[PDB]
Structure formats: structure tokens, C-alpha cells
Design a binder for this molecule. Structure first.
Ligand code: XNV
Length: 178
């Protein structure tokens, strides 16, 4: 698990800074990356401290117009991400997953969040959010955007918690299709 998590840290996971602070950003493919919606990125963000113009941005909502707490960004930079869409899996039920963080004080951080489960529709920051993956791990401030994953499987992006549970926005391959 650590070897797969380390591979994501070298080739896909970066630190993205908005006006709301530092967030772990996962590069999906080409110049497309994901970030929690509550980061509220503007026309420009910092990628590992470098000012990068945001070409495209759109918040993800399910077909039932329910918030997904995920925002897909297209960056105007030269480096193309490694295509990790093949690792995105929806078979997460009961998997002992790992959260890969690279933001704030948690740089190059690999956490064992225990077994995950599809919580579904929960009230996240007074906003109903669907496709919620829950793990019984005390995630902390500065870890939003961490990549929930296991060996050869990417499950979602951490979006919040309550000091005892943590929640990740489910990643699906259909999100990156026009
Ligand atoms: C990441 C954001 C951060 O670190 O600062 C940004 C620079 C945090 C991670 C949370 C904080 C506590 N433990 C975590 O894992 N995310 C949030 O703080 C989000 C922001 C949004 C949207 N947030 C804000 C307000 C409430 C909650 N949590 C819940 O509403 C909730 C519901 C249930 C059920 O359990 N928790 C929240 O995540």
C-alpha cells in the first residue's frame, strides 16, 4: 500500500493553495486535477508554490443535483499528469484504505484510515453531499484533499470530518468525460 501511495506522491499528488489555505491536489490526467469544492479556487492557484492560471473549473454534482464536494480543475502548466484513471475503483466496501496527504504540516504523509464504507448521503457543512465514503479515523485540519486509496485502487478525495470520522468524496471515471 505504501509503495502505491508513494508512486502517487511522486507523479500525481501536489499542494494546491487557494485563498482558503493549502489543499492536497490529485492530478488525474493531462492537466486535469481535483480539489475539494470548499477550497473555492479562483482564476489562479498555487501549485507547489507556483502561480498557475486555472484554465477550467467546474463543481461536480450528481444527476439528482446533489452536491458532491468535488471540483475538477484544468491547469495551464506544461507538466502533464500520469493517467491514473485506470486505478479509480468503486469496489471500496470494507477495504483497509490509506490516505495520502501532501498539504500544510502533513507533507508526504501516508495514513492508515482503516476499513472504509459507502456512507452515501450525509449532511456535510450544512450541505447534503452524496457518494460519501466514511472511515473511522480522526482526520485533522490541513488534510483535506488527501487521496483515499489502496494498492492499485483509488477511491476518493478527503473532504472533511468530525474529529472521530473522516469522509472522502468518491472518485468516478465518468467525472473526467465530457
Ligand atoms: C479540511 C480543510 C482544512 O483542513 O483547512 C483548509 C485549509 C477539513 C478536514 C476536516 C476538519 C476536521 N476533521 C476533518 O477531517 N475539512 C473541513 O473542515 C470541512 C470544510 C467544508 C466543507 N468541514 C467544514 C464544517 C463541518 C464539517 N464536517 C461535517 O459537517 C460532518 C458531518 C458529519 C456526519 O461528520 N462531519 C467539514 O468537514
Amino acid at each position: 500500500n505504501t509503495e502505491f501511495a508513494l508512486s502517487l506522491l511522486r507523479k500525481n499528488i501536489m499542494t494546491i493553495t487557494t485563498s482558503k489555505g493549502e489543499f492536497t491536489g490529485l492530478g488525474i490526467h493531462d492537466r486535469v486535477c481535483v480539489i475539494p469544492t470548499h477550497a473555492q479556487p479562483g482564476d489562479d492557484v498555487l501549485v507547489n508554490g507556483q502561480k498557475i492560471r486555472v484554465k477550467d473549473k467546474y463543481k461536480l454534482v450528481d444527476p439528482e443535483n446533489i452536491n458532491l464536494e468535488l471540483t475538477v480543475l484544468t491547469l495551464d502548466r506544461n507538466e502533464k499528469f500520469r493517467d491514473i484513471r485506470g486505478f479509480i475503483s468503486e469496489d471500496l466496501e470494507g477495504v483497509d484504505a490509506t490516505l495520502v496527504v501532501h498539504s500544510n504540516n502533513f507533507t508526504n504523509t501516508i495514513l492508515e484510515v482503516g476499513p472504509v464504507t459507502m456512507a452515501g448521503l450525509i449532511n456535510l457543512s450544512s450541505t447534503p453531499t452524496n457518494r460519501m465514503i466514511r472511515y473511522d479515523y480522526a482526520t485533522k485540519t490541513g488534510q483535506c484533499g488527501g487521496v483515499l486509496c489502496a494498492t492499485g485502487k483509488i477511491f476518493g478525495i478527503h473532504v472533511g470530518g468530525n474529529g472521530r470520522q473522516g469522509f472522502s468524496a468518491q472518485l468516478k471515471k465518468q467525472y473526467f468525460v465530457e
